[PDB]
Ligand binder design. Structure first.
Ligand SMILES: N[C@@H](CCC(=O)N[C@@H](CS)C(=O)NCC(=O)O)C(=O)O
Ligand SMILES: N[C@@H](CCC(=O)N[C@@H](CS)C(=O)NCC(=O)O)C(=O)O
Ligand SMILES: [Ca+2]
Ligand SMILES: [Ca+2]
Ligand SMILES: [Pt+2]
Ligand SMILES: [Pt+2]
Ligand SMILES: [Pt+2]
Lengths: 210, 209
């Protein structure tokens, strides 16, 4: 059996990026799906460290927290910079991605109707830092940090993909980010995964909003 | 090194990394940014995500409090003994960060109306860290493994500020209580925590705690 198991709801959500990472890196894993019904029964939830999913298994190592899973795979698969300095820049990018993801999640689940207009208006100011990072790294022609892909690339890519669904054309103001999405999305193993039923037939979020 | 931390005159998101630096016998410079200086706008516009802290390690400039913690963790060897422990360290820190975010939201956006529900929910939010301790050397060492990690400093801060918010919140948790006492007694950290540099800063920037 595969050494990796992803335990999650039937959504892309906070597992989209780590799945893209595993697929693009040619790693095999198992998906264990948790229905809302099973979740509401409460026993799985009570057994989760912080009462939430995803849960991730790497052999007998059990992890929670999506960014913990990303960093773990980043370490073990060599997607965490070429040295200690790059590692810090990778973290700086991912923490930035996480900050915006939290705001996105808040909009989706708690304030979509009333909050969307304001959110989209504020969105360019939130995306600009990643354009800036790209512009300062080899003219934005490679990756978000250095000249090799990192776990932060997969997370940023997901963030950008879901925001294009939320606010179509939001990357028209950001040529480097736009080219970056096209470029990474064209990586053969990743392109195949993104096109597959395994990815396409899951909703982005759990409440039907996107 | 050398280290410079750039921040408002509060403990806030720099409390943990300061405890780390002090406990680890590191030297650093504080560049205090006043609210008036911040409102001028130029510094803010120059920050990657428009926020402090900003951190300098020689010619390396960092933003994001947890990036700074992880950087110090990796460079000073406060990140567990191997990859499996490093993952556990991240799991703790991400958990600490999740509760810190909830704390910050309470303090700055909903203190008066929201404190009652927050404090009622607090035991269930703290229990995971007690459980983690219980599963590591009976809670007698650190939150992960047998050596201190950056997650310890972050968790310690989280616990200290919650004792201020909700006195007695650790009384039902013997391992966390003993852990706070034990880490706080570490000589360099004890001296730092007792110093005006720590004591005479407010925890947050809006006078609430
Ligand atoms: N900080 C956590 C947050 C995880 C989280 O919010 N999980 C949600 C779904 S994405 C969940 O389990 N909701 C059910 C519940 O909280 O009871 C992470 O990064 O994984
Ligand atoms: N995720 C960031 C959040 C940083 C943050 O929230 N900084 C606040 C003070 S703690 C700030 O700069 N406020 C002023 C502003 O946003 O303009 C981190 O961990 O450092
Ligand atoms: Ca100074
Ligand atoms: Ca050590
Ligand atoms: Pt969040
Ligand atoms: Pt937050
Ligand atoms: Pt948050």
């Amino acid at each position: 059996m595969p050494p990796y198991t992803v335990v999650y709801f039937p959504v892309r959500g906070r597992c989209a990026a780590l799945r893209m990472l595993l697929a693009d890196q040619g790693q095999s894993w198992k998906e264990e799906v948790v229905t809302v019904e099973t979740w509401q029964e409460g026993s799985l939830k009570a057994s989760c460290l912080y009462g939430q999913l995803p849960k991730f298994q790497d052999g007998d190592l059990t992890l929670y927290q999506s960014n913990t899973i990303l960093r773990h795979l980043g370490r073990t698969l060599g997607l965490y910079g070429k040295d200690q300095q790059e590692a810090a820049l990778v973290d700086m990018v991912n923490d930035g991605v996480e900050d915006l993801r939290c705001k996105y999640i808040s909009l989706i689940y708690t304030n979509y109707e009333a909050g969307k207009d304001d959110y989209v208006k504020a969105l360019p100011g939130q995306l600009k830092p990643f354009e800036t990072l790209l512009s300062q790294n080899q003219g934005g022609k490679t990756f978000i940090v250095g000249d090799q892909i990192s776990f932060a690339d997969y997370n940023l890519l997901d963030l950008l993909l879901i925001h294009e669904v939320l606010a179509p054309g939001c990357l028209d103001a950001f040529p480097l980010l736009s080219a970056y999405v096209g470029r990474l999305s064209a990586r053969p193993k990743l392109k195949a995964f993104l096109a597959s039923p395994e990815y396409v037939n899951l909703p982005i979020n759990g409440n039907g909003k996107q």
